[PDB]
Design an enzyme around this catalytic site. Structure first.
Site, PDB file in Angstrom:
ATOM      1  N   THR A  18       0.940  -1.302  -0.167  1.00  0.00           N
ATOM      2  CA  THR A  18      -0.169  -0.080   0.010  1.00  0.00           C
ATOM      3  C   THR A  18       0.704   1.263   0.049  1.00  0.00           C
ATOM      4  OG1 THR A  18      -0.074   0.134   2.300  1.00  0.00           O
ATOM      5  CG2 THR A  18      -1.622  -1.261   1.547  1.00  0.00           C
ATOM      6  N   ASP A  45      -0.752  -5.088   3.054  1.00  0.00           N
ATOM      7  CA  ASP A  45       0.658  -4.707   4.123  1.00  0.00           C
ATOM      8  C   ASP A  45       0.536  -2.828   4.095  1.00  0.00           C
ATOM      9  OD1 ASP A  45       3.558  -5.188   4.983  1.00  0.00           O
ATOM     10  OD2 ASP A  45       3.766  -3.417   4.008  1.00  0.00           O
ATOM     11  N   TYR A  50       3.470   4.873   6.561  1.00  0.00           N
ATOM     12  CA  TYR A  50       2.913   5.317   5.275  1.00  0.00           C
ATOM     13  C   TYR A  50       1.888   6.169   5.186  1.00  0.00           C
ATOM     14  CZ  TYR A  50       4.805   0.487   4.211  1.00  0.00           C
ATOM     15  OH  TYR A  50       5.855  -0.583   3.874  1.00  0.00           O
ATOM     16  N   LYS A  79       3.033  -2.080  10.947  1.00  0.00           N
ATOM     17  CA  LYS A  79       4.321  -2.036  11.519  1.00  0.00           C
ATOM     18  C   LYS A  79       4.664  -0.817  12.488  1.00  0.00           C
ATOM     19  CE  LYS A  79       5.442  -3.411   6.646  1.00  0.00           C
ATOM     20  NZ  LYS A  79       4.887  -2.219   5.666  1.00  0.00           N
ATOM     21  N   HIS A 112       9.317  -2.421  12.292  1.00  0.00           N
ATOM     22  CA  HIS A 112       9.495  -1.820  10.866  1.00  0.00           C
ATOM     23  C   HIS A 112      10.952  -2.185  10.534  1.00  0.00           C
ATOM     24  CE1 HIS A 112       7.537   0.802   7.643  1.00  0.00           C
ATOM     25  NE2 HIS A 112       8.722   0.139   6.888  1.00  0.00           N
ATOM     26  N   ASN A 162      13.477  -5.974   7.928  1.00  0.00           N
ATOM     27  CA  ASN A 162      14.637  -5.357   7.704  1.00  0.00           C
ATOM     28  C   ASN A 162      16.008  -5.805   8.674  1.00  0.00           C
ATOM     29  OD1 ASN A 162      14.377  -3.801   5.522  1.00  0.00           O
ATOM     30  ND2 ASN A 162      12.865  -2.601   6.591  1.00  0.00           N
ATOM     31  N   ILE A 272      -3.035  -3.936 -10.959  1.00  0.00           N
ATOM     32  CA  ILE A 272      -3.556  -4.778  -9.886  1.00  0.00           C
ATOM     33  C   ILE A 272      -4.220  -6.078 -10.235  1.00  0.00           C
ATOM     34  CG2 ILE A 272      -5.107  -4.658  -7.801  1.00  0.00           C
ATOM     35  CD1 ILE A 272      -4.794  -1.757  -7.779  1.00  0.00           C
ATOM     36  N   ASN A 275      -1.565  -8.764 -11.192  1.00  0.00           N
ATOM     37  CA  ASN A 275      -0.638  -9.428 -10.433  1.00  0.00           C
ATOM     38  C   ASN A 275      -1.444 -10.650  -9.707  1.00  0.00           C
ATOM     39  OD1 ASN A 275       1.079  -7.513 -11.100  1.00  0.00           O
ATOM     40  ND2 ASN A 275       0.586  -6.266  -9.260  1.00  0.00           N
TER      41      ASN A 275
HETATM   42  N1  LIG Z   1       9.291  -3.269   5.442  1.00  0.00           N
HETATM   43  C1  LIG Z   1       9.864  -2.379   4.707  1.00  0.00           C
HETATM   44  O1  LIG Z   1      11.215  -1.790   4.700  1.00  0.00           O
HETATM   45  C2  LIG Z   1       9.214  -2.091   3.169  1.00  0.00           C
HETATM   46  C3  LIG Z   1      10.068  -1.502   2.263  1.00  0.00           C
HETATM   47  C4  LIG Z   1       9.454  -1.286   0.833  1.00  0.00           C
HETATM   48  C5  LIG Z   1       8.196  -1.834   0.714  1.00  0.00           C
HETATM   49  N2  LIG Z   1       7.839  -2.291   1.404  1.00  0.00           N
HETATM   50  C6  LIG Z   1       6.080  -2.898   1.374  1.00  0.00           C
HETATM   51  O2  LIG Z   1       6.159  -3.808   0.344  1.00  0.00           O
HETATM   52  C7  LIG Z   1       5.232  -3.280  -0.866  1.00  0.00           C
HETATM   53  C8  LIG Z   1       5.755  -3.462  -2.338  1.00  0.00           C
HETATM   54  O3  LIG Z   1       7.097  -2.723  -2.471  1.00  0.00           O
HETATM   55  P1  LIG Z   1       7.395  -1.378  -3.225  1.00  0.00           P
HETATM   56  O4  LIG Z   1       6.524  -0.517  -2.829  1.00  0.00           O
HETATM   57  O5  LIG Z   1       8.846  -1.220  -3.315  1.00  0.00           O
HETATM   58  O6  LIG Z   1       7.137  -1.690  -4.855  1.00  0.00           O
HETATM   59  P2  LIG Z   1       6.835  -2.989  -5.831  1.00  0.00           P
HETATM   60  O7  LIG Z   1       5.991  -4.158  -5.340  1.00  0.00           O
HETATM   61  O8  LIG Z   1       8.547  -3.682  -5.848  1.00  0.00           O
HETATM   62  O9  LIG Z   1       6.543  -2.360  -7.019  1.00  0.00           O
HETATM   63  C9  LIG Z   1       7.245  -1.458  -7.858  1.00  0.00           C
HETATM   64  C10 LIG Z   1       6.551  -0.849  -8.838  1.00  0.00           C
HETATM   65  O10 LIG Z   1       6.104  -1.893  -9.829  1.00  0.00           O
HETATM   66  C11 LIG Z   1       4.958  -1.435 -10.429  1.00  0.00           C
HETATM   67  N3  LIG Z   1       4.010  -2.586 -11.008  1.00  0.00           N
HETATM   68  C12 LIG Z   1       3.099  -3.385 -10.282  1.00  0.00           C
HETATM   69  N4  LIG Z   1       2.633  -4.078 -10.980  1.00  0.00           N
HETATM   70  C13 LIG Z   1       3.098  -4.166 -12.216  1.00  0.00           C
HETATM   71  C14 LIG Z   1       3.048  -5.103 -13.270  1.00  0.00           C
HETATM   72  N5  LIG Z   1       2.218  -5.919 -13.165  1.00  0.00           N
HETATM   73  N6  LIG Z   1       3.637  -4.773 -14.362  1.00  0.00           N
HETATM   74  C15 LIG Z   1       4.781  -3.650 -14.321  1.00  0.00           C
HETATM   75  N7  LIG Z   1       4.857  -3.009 -13.266  1.00  0.00           N
HETATM   76  C16 LIG Z   1       4.173  -3.317 -12.179  1.00  0.00           C
HETATM   77  C17 LIG Z   1       4.177  -0.515  -9.658  1.00  0.00           C
HETATM   78  O11 LIG Z   1       3.834   0.702 -10.343  1.00  0.00           O
HETATM   79  P3  LIG Z   1       2.015   1.179 -10.458  1.00  0.00           P
HETATM   80  O12 LIG Z   1       1.804   1.724  -9.015  1.00  0.00           O
HETATM   81  O13 LIG Z   1       2.113   2.460 -11.497  1.00  0.00           O
HETATM   82  O14 LIG Z   1       1.555   0.056 -11.014  1.00  0.00           O
HETATM   83  C18 LIG Z   1       5.041  -0.250  -8.511  1.00  0.00           C
HETATM   84  O15 LIG Z   1       5.482   1.346  -8.164  1.00  0.00           O
HETATM   85  C19 LIG Z   1       5.225  -1.564  -0.590  1.00  0.00           C
HETATM   86  O16 LIG Z   1       3.999  -1.116  -0.914  1.00  0.00           O
HETATM   87  C20 LIG Z   1       5.438  -1.822   1.124  1.00  0.00           C
HETATM   88  O17 LIG Z   1       3.765  -2.304   1.396  1.00  0.00           O
HETATM   89  C21 LIG Z   1       7.993  -2.753   2.755  1.00  0.00           C
HETATM   90  O1  LIG Z   2       9.796   4.098   0.223  1.00  0.00           O
HETATM   91  C1  LIG Z   2      10.156   4.047   1.327  1.00  0.00           C
HETATM   92  C2  LIG Z   2      11.073   5.284   2.067  1.00  0.00           C
HETATM   93  C3  LIG Z   2      11.716   4.522   3.512  1.00  0.00           C
HETATM   94  C4  LIG Z   2      11.916   5.703   4.487  1.00  0.00           C
HETATM   95  C5  LIG Z   2      11.087   6.799   4.577  1.00  0.00           C
HETATM   96  C6  LIG Z   2      11.258   7.856   5.668  1.00  0.00           C
HETATM   97  C7  LIG Z   2      12.381   7.535   6.286  1.00  0.00           C
HETATM   98  O2  LIG Z   2      12.711   8.687   7.410  1.00  0.00           O
HETATM   99  C8  LIG Z   2      13.291   6.478   6.081  1.00  0.00           C
HETATM  100  C9  LIG Z   2      13.030   5.520   5.264  1.00  0.00           C
HETATM  101  O3  LIG Z   2      11.173   3.441   4.012  1.00  0.00           O
HETATM  102  C10 LIG Z   2      10.226   2.750   3.608  1.00  0.00           C
HETATM  103  C11 LIG Z   2       9.468   1.734   4.329  1.00  0.00           C
HETATM  104  C12 LIG Z   2       8.486   1.097   3.879  1.00  0.00           C
HETATM  105  O4  LIG Z   2       7.938  -0.045   4.298  1.00  0.00           O
HETATM  106  C13 LIG Z   2       8.059   1.253   2.379  1.00  0.00           C
HETATM  107  C14 LIG Z   2       8.711   2.214   1.626  1.00  0.00           C
HETATM  108  C15 LIG Z   2       9.805   2.960   2.270  1.00  0.00           C
END
Ligand SMILES: NC(=O)c1ccc[n+]([C@@H]2O[C@H](COP(=O)([O-])OP(=O)(O)OC[C@H]3O[C@@H](n4cnc5c(N)ncnc54)[C@H](OP(=O)(O)O)[C@@H]3O)[C@@H](O)[C@H]2O)c1
Ligand SMILES: O=C1C[C@@H](c2ccc(O)cc2)Oc2cc(O)ccc21
Length: 314
Positions: A18, A45, A50, A79, A112, A162, A272, A275
């Site tokens: 999200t 998620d 966020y 988180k 987180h 992480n 969406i 996927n």
């Molecule tokens: N715990 C952490 O530190 C952490 C860090 C990063 C992310 N996360 C979580 O993981 C989620 C996913 O990771 P992420 O946000 O880095 O992105 P991602 O899942 O790796 O997606 C990257 C990009 O892919 C595009 N995309 C999606 N479906 C696609 C498809 N079928 N074909 C082509 N492109 C496609 C999207 O653009 P469009 O939106 O334009 O479709 C999106 O911006 C986050 O939203 C968050 O919930 C957690």
């Molecule tokens: O795209 C980001 C930015 C990054 C971040 C933002 C602010 C900050 O102060 C430190 C790290 O952490 C993240 C954590 C998430 O779960 C998803 C996406 C991101």
């Protein structure tokens, strides 16, 4: 469909990510989260970071109200952000996330990040000169508070995000530990498959949950814009053409077949809906080893500031 966690709860293996940057209006998160659920997503998620809990929460309650799903059909994750690591701040932070989302419980509550930040009302506390301000917190005390949250039924399951192998073992070896983490949510894609960490998690029955599985949103605040674009990879594109699927579907299917639970963010109705097709096809053993071969030790997230954190997992 789902995988059995080590506390006996059940996690769906495909999850909707999200997070959107602050430039995207808050209303979109409500719109797209309903669309995700409408397309088939049941794992959702979110996080305090966020700034979207209200909207994601309302989308869940929207889809329960119109009869599409019930609360027990939905796996909702939040988180604990890094400014709330101090043990006495954990439960109010969770209770605050519940209140924003207007839910009684989260299915999953995570630490987180291991990189504690200065307590306060600021997501990214920066000093008089713009440098982030770190805090020092024994993460075992944070975990003890996480456990209290599960025992209060506020979180069905608890886990981390992480964490490296060393930071996990610290939890696993804590004296008097009550609940093992049910998962470790980490960056995981064909350019960084985390195979060694994945094998360690399997050895402790810890689920690895992959984020940035499609190569991340490539936000230039956090990602070098001249890094390779995961979805433009020739092996991935050649496998998409072979299976009449799409690079993103290949990258998602790769994780499911390795026993990884995979996230996919999209704010685009058709992507969406695309996927959820991940369950419709199979990668061969030969395709899997070819995707294994793309591993490049590349984590897209790069920050000179957090690299000096005594908690930096990389
Ligand atoms: N715990 C952490 O530190 C952490 C860090 C990063 C992310 N996360 C979580 O993981 C989620 C996913 O990771 P992420 O946000 O880095 O992105 P991602 O899942 O790796 O997606 C990257 C990009 O892919 C595009 N995309 C999606 N479906 C696609 C498809 N079928 N074909 C082509 N492109 C496609 C999207 O653009 P469009 O939106 O334009 O479709 C999106 O911006 C986050 O939203 C968050 O919930 C957690
Ligand atoms: O795209 C980001 C930015 C990054 C971040 C933002 C602010 C900050 O102060 C430190 C790290 O952490 C993240 C954590 C998430 O779960 C998803 C996406 C991101």
């Amino acid at each position: 469909q789902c995988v059995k966690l080590n506390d006996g709860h059940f996690m769906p293996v495909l999850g909707f990510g999200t997070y959107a940057p602050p430039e995207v209006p808050r209303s979109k998160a409500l719109e797209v989260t309903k669309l995700a659920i409408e397309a088939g997503f049941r794992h959702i998620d979110s996080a305090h970071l966020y700034n979207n809990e209200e909207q994601v929460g309302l989308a869940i309650r929207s889809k329960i109200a119109d009869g599409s799903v019930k609360r027990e059909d939905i796996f909702y994750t939040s988180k604990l952000w890094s400014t709330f690591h101090r043990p006495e701040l954990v439960r109010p932070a969770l209770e605050n996330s519940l209140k924003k989302a207007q839910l009684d419980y989260v299915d999953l509550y995570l630490i987180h990040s291991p990189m504690s930040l200065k307590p306060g009302e600021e997501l990214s506390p920066t000093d008089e000169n713009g440098k982030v301000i770190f805090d020092i917190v024994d993460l075992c005390t944070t975990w003890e508070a996480m456990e209290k949250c599960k025992d209060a039924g506020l979180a069905k399951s608890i886990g981390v995000s992480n964490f490296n192998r060393r930071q996990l073992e610290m939890i696993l070896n804590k004296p008097g530990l009550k609940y093992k983490p049910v998962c470790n949510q980490v960056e995981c894609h064909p350019y960084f498959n985390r195979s060694k960490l994945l094998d360690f998690c399997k050895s402790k029955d810890i689920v690895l949950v992959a984020y940035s599985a499609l190569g991340s949103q490539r936000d230039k605040r956090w990602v070098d814009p001249n890094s390779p674009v995961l979805l433009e990879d020739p092996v991935l594109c050649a496998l998409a053409k072979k299976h009449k699927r799409t690079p993103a579907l290949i990258a998602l299917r790769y994780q499911l077949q390795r026993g990884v639970v995979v996230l996919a963010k999209s704010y685009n109705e058709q992507r969406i809906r695309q996927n959820v097709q991940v369950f419709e096809f199979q990668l061969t053993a030969e395709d899997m080893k070819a995707i294994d071969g793309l591993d490049r030790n590349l984590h897209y997230f790069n920050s000179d500031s957090f690299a000096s954190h005594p908690n930096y997992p990389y």
